[PDB]
Amino acid sequence: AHFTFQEYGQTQKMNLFQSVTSALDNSLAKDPTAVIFGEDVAFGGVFRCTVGLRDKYGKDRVFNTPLCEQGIVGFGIGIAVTGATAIAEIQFADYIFPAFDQIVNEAAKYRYRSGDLFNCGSLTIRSPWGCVGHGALYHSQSPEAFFAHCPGIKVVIPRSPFQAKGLLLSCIEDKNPCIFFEPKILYRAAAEEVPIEPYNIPLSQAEVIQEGSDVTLVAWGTQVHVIREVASMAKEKLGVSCEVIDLRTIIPWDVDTICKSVIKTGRLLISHEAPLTGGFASEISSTVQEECFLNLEAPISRVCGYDTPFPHIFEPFYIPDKWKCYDALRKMINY
Amino acid sequence: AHFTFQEYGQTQKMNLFQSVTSALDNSLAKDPTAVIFGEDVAFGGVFRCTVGLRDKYGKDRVFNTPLCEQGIVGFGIGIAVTGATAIAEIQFADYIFPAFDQIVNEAAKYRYRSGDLFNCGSLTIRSPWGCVGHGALYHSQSPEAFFAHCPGIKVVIPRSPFQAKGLLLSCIEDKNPCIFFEPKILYRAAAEEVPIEPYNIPLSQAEVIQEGSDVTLVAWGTQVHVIREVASMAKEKLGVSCEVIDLRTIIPWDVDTICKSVIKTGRLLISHEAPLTGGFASEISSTVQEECFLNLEAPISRVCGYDTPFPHIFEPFYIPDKWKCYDALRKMINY
Amino acid sequence: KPQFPGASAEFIDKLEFIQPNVISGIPIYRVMDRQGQIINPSEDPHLPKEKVLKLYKSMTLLNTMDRILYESQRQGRISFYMTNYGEEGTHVGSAAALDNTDLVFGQYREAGVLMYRDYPLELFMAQCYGNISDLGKGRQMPVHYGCKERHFVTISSPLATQIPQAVGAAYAAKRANANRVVICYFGEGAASEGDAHAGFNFAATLECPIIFFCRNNGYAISTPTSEQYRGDGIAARGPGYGIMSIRVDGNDVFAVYNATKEARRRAVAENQPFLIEAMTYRIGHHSTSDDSSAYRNYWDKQDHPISRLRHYLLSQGWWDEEQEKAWRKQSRRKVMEAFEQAERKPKPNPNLLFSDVYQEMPAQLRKQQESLARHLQTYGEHYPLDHFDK
Amino acid sequence: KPQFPGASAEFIDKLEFIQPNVISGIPIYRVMDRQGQIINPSEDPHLPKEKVLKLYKSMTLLNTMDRILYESQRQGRISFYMTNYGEEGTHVGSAAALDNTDLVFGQYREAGVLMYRDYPLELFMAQCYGNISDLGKGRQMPVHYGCKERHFVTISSPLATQIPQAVGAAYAAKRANANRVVICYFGEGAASEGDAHAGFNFAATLECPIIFFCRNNGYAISTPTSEQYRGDGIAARGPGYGIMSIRVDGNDVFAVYNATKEARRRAVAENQPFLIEAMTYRIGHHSTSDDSSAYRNYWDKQDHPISRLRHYLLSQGWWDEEQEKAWRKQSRRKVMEAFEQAERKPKPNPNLLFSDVYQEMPAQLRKQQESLARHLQTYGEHYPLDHFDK
Numbered sequence A, B: 001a002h003f004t005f006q007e008y009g010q011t012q013k014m015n016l017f018q019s020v021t022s023a024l025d026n027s028l029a030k031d032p033t034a035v036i037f038g039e040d041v042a043f044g045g046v047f048r049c050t051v052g053l054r055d056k057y058g059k060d061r062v063f064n065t066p067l068c069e070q071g072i073v074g075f076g077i078g079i080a081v082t083g084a085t086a087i088a089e090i091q092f093a094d095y096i097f098p099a100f101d102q103i104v105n106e107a108a109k110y111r112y113r114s115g116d117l118f119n120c121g122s123l124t125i126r127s128p129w130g131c132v133g134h135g136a137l138y139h140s141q142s143p144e145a146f147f148a149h150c151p152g153i154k155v156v157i158p159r160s161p162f163q164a165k166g167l168l169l170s171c172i173e174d175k176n177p178c179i180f181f182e183p184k185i186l187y188r189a190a191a192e193e194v195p196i197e198p199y200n201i202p203l204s205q206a207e208v209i210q211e212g213s214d215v216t217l218v219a220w221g222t223q224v225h226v227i228r229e230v231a232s233m234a235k236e237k238l239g240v241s242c243e244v245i246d247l248r249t250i251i252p253w254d255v256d257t258i259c260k261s262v263i264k265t266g267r268l269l270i271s272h273e274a275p276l277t278g279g280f281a282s283e284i285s286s287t288v289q290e291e292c293f294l295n296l297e298a299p300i301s302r303v304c305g306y307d308t309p310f311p312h313i314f315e316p317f318y319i320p321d322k323w324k325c326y327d328a329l330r331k332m333i334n335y
Numbered sequence C, D: 001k002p003q004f005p006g007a008s009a010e011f012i013d014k015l016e017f018i019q020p021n022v023i024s025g026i027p028i029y030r031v032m033d034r035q036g037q038i039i040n041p042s043e044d045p046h047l048p049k050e051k052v053l054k055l056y057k058s059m060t061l062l063n064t065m066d067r068i069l070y071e072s073q074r075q076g077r078i079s080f081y082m083t084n085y086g087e088e089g090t091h092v093g094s095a096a097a098l099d100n101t102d103l104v105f106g107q108y109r110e111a112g113v114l115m116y117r118d119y120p121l122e123l124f125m126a127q128c129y130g131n132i133s134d135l136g137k138g139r140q141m142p143v144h145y146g147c148k149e150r151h152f153v154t155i156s157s158p159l160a161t162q163i164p165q166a167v168g169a170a171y172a173a174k175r176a177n178a179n180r181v182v183i184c185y186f187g188e189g190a191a192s193e194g195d196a197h198a199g200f201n202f203a204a205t206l207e208c209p210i211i212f213f214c215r216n217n218g219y220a221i222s223t224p225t226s227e228q229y230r231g232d233g234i235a236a237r238g239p240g241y242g243i244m245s246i247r248v249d250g251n252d253v254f255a256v257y258n259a260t261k262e263a264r265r266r267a268v269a270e271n272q273p274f275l276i277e278a279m280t281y282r283i284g285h286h287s288t289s290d291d292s293s294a295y296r297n298y299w300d301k302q303d304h305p306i307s308r309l310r311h312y313l314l315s316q317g318w319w320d321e322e323q324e325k326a327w328r329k330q331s332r333r334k335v336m337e338a339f340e341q342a343e344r345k346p347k348p349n350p351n352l353l354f355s356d357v358y359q360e361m362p363a364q365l366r367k368q369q370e371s372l373a374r375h376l377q378t379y380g381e382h383y384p385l386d387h388f389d390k
Ligand SMILES: Cc1ncc(C[n+]2c([C-](O)C(C)C)sc(CCOP(=O)(O)OP(=O)(O)O)c2C)c(N)n1
Pocket: B039, B067, B069, B091, B095, B098, C108, C109, C156, C157, C158, C159, C186, C187, C188, C189, C190, C191, C215, C217, C219, C220, C221, C282, C286, C287
């Protein structure tokens, strides 16, 4: 395995799918308008994220749709126009594309184009995301950069069960249409303590998970765990102190936390599983260069997936793993 | 108006729509398999780009489809799988989104995922693109950055009638699925001499249209004319010599021409009508920073559309016009 | 007996393809003839005088407004316009059969619904001019109307996207236990999009109180219905989805009203979708960007919704030449008053280009707004500032 | 008489909604009973002995291969698998009615078509293992087969995308004057996507020689047909699009063959689409990632395509226990030989991760390939290099 997973009242050990269920549970209990729907959600979903909710809340609030993603998102928009909370599920992020027009032309623009007479702020679209070891072209994709070029939506990716429940509760409650991408490899990979009761993590705020003084590393989702290990390799093998940052919200993103870090370190490495070209690291890199030009001691490095579709048998060679990141960091330190 | 429009045998004065027709004409005459189709193309199209072709080539080769963009692109892929040339039209770039899944999951991946047993290299999708003065949210969009994050397709934007015919002929003939975006404001805005006979302009190659030594300006489509004027304002008002570059191909893009220019000037300004965040200038900026770090004298500037949907009445305040670009250039020169 | 989960059916021991019925399609329901006479007394809705007069005056006021705004576009006073000629009957017949609070989604050629719901002339014009009175803040192109007060969801240009949204809003109403229906208008062209198939199927499987209302006017821009579909119109698709369906004469206000009234009753009661296809003809160009003589008038002179209704009113003793003259005049004045006021208003503050993208304004977006403000301070002489508020 | 361009129809003077016929749906064509007896002699296709035996042996070899590869997945030798249990009859019945060169697009549960077309065991296994013999170069997940030689377009995971592509390929064939049909397989779940509506309508309006073949097996993963649609199955949608339609017993090879043969004849001759809905039942789990006891067997024991065909062969004197035993053995050996060979092959060169993204390799992509090469030179001990070619 390419990664290692490593105040608020009572907590229980939860894996990532359980913490999604807890978030959904808390939401349906406190918001009578809230409904969950999409493909195969009724029996508990193909990743188990909705287990027991239809029994608890009723078949009118947790239900299967026909197999039509443009319909699922159009339907969720319509529910949210009435003011009801619509939690739509898209079965894999790779299958969000049939809904792209509903998301980009419709949900993102609904408030703006109506002068705020109408909105779909109460829509959240949840979708498993990212590589899984063997998902190949259509069960592995990270589409966040496609959505980052769309003013009007929020895109949010957690790195852990505690983060997932707090960020999902934030998306569900946020007054803007949100896409919540759940790293599917983490669904059943290590548990942590998660508060039983509802709590929120702020959107548009990065988290500095480890302080450092030599270089700034930025990632999101599973890749955070990859950079955490890179920090460890760098301290041990090179005596390099790394500041590790989880971006968490893709848009609108926390420009200030990133620039502040880089102003202190002078070096930045961004890493994501998505292809390099057009990937979201490009937006981060461009912006930091613009704000921290006087502070930058080395070219900003992006360690990303290659500019190919996501392969089956070659996955171990495709992903921006700890060695790829370390080497790039080594070279950036030698610059 | 926010812009001014300013070897190969016999030529005729052609506007941009005429040069598209000439390209299509030459293509159908020399390639018996070639067909053109989409909404309203039979009577000559809503921008007149297919006038007279159905009369010339027959109703089986120039025809209307039902009003379904996912169908239009799926259909074009199928035609191209058999080896026939499929020239699909999408009526406005703003309406390409229903086809996003067919383009991104299917056409971009068709050769790769089959081990080259099958392909749709003979598909070209043509679509009017860019602002038009009054098109508002859904007759103005520039979606090229959405497509730039998709390995497997080529995206191409001309700045003029001569460029359009040579680049479209290149897309039609290229062995990869291509999206050709035609700046609709230019359709009937100034003519130039265009060769009657077919000729090609290379894909993935920028064009340095004006040599300069102080700063590099990069744009594509109508925005090239905007930066050409900015160069003129800069020479006149500031004594600044600008190198003006038309990128022409969005992906794969001509990294070497851009880096070479910037290595000589030390300053780069990229401009596009599309929103800043996630726009293609971010990819250019990031990459140049990576290659020309030692050469860069000032932060790379991006002058783009704001991070909003494209407005109706506010268009004059939204677009990255000559004054916005000039001011940014002025400041970058003072850095 | 067959056991398969996927269908309820018998076996057949002989190979027989199911042929479509396109030549003898679903018949077209009609209440009044082209002379405005009732054909079948038991179908007469017997609407009271004041209501029928309101249907009539709403359709002529829309027609008056269409003429004036079409001219305004030709002269470049507004950037764009789409008329509603020939389809005025489908708009007002259907809107009159709805409750005031039934939620409406549309396409763009349904302004008579808003007119029937008493949307001010000033506001139709504010949107077309993008002026300060526009509650849409001048952001969308002309005829992209919306009204929260009158439960008319803001129009957007992408065809058929509103179909599965209407279905979601209908689901929510069901849950709310609303006694409310949602109606969803689209043309025959738009019915070709994937979103139509999504909405139709979702409506039936999720059991939604919705009315799908298809204006079949024979063309989508230049494309005739013969290139749009090969089955018997839109109405014949409904049954395949399990949706109750009817086809009506869209030039007959009372046929449209009757079908809409009964669909509404039954949709709300049963939580089931109804499909109405109103057969009409698009008498004008597609829009101001279209010259329709390039691809194709009887309808205008011999089968027009407004003339038919006018003949009906005369048959009851409810209208005459004098009243027609005085109203032609009053409506011209009401429209020209709104028009002059709309032209004299300033456009909204250029600041409004940045608000409502999100509910709150993100800080990076505020920074772009600040950039514009500083830009206009230095370069403002190059911008049309004197037309814009503040 | 109605004049509207959009439909051919009469007027009706009374309001009547068209009710769907869901309880008495389109009847299900059947040739042989569950004891493999012919029901109606005039429908018997009288296929010769060698052909029927080939149908039978193809379906049991697929079944043998399914058992072995399913086990291989459970043990983690391959990453994923999907069986074809219960649907073997739809695959081979339809494939036998096609010409060798008719172009096939599928979904993922149609491997019997390739088996019938004599696709080597070695190649089914090469793809599931992603080994050097895979012409797909190990790039797609298991069961994503494709064969250019056998005119079987490479499967992709996104549901229903192949439907409007099949239609384009059929248009092109028409133009080429091919005497060739395209067939397009999908399940009842996939028929819910927008792309299905696009393909159906395009096929009818553009007059394409295509066969749409829907495997209705009662479930899309966990979702029963009652949550998938409310009309009478997929077959009842065809007529609305103007498409000739039939429903067949998908467990009856000869019913499937007969419908497919006649659709093919008529599609090619008339340039018109045919829709066949084969009613079946998904006897296995949805895939190896699915435990199907979580949402729902008679079919296996009492209405199985393979058992029915086996009863038929015995009735002709074409098979017996001895032959069944010897073939059970030969097929196990043929499959285990391919399986062992597939496991011993190396995976392809990691270089192949970069080729075919475009026809040519762009220079920036070659530079990424170079980067990988240098990376593996330094860090290669951390990668599974010894399993991969070169
Ligand atoms: C998804 C998509 N594709 C194409 C169009 C272009 N379009 C139009 C616009 O751009 C308007 C709103 C200005 S209207 C239109 C014709 C639709 O025909 P229809 O029969 O549905 O409606 P009408 O006959 O009442 O115009 C198209 C193809 C569009 N609006 N949306």
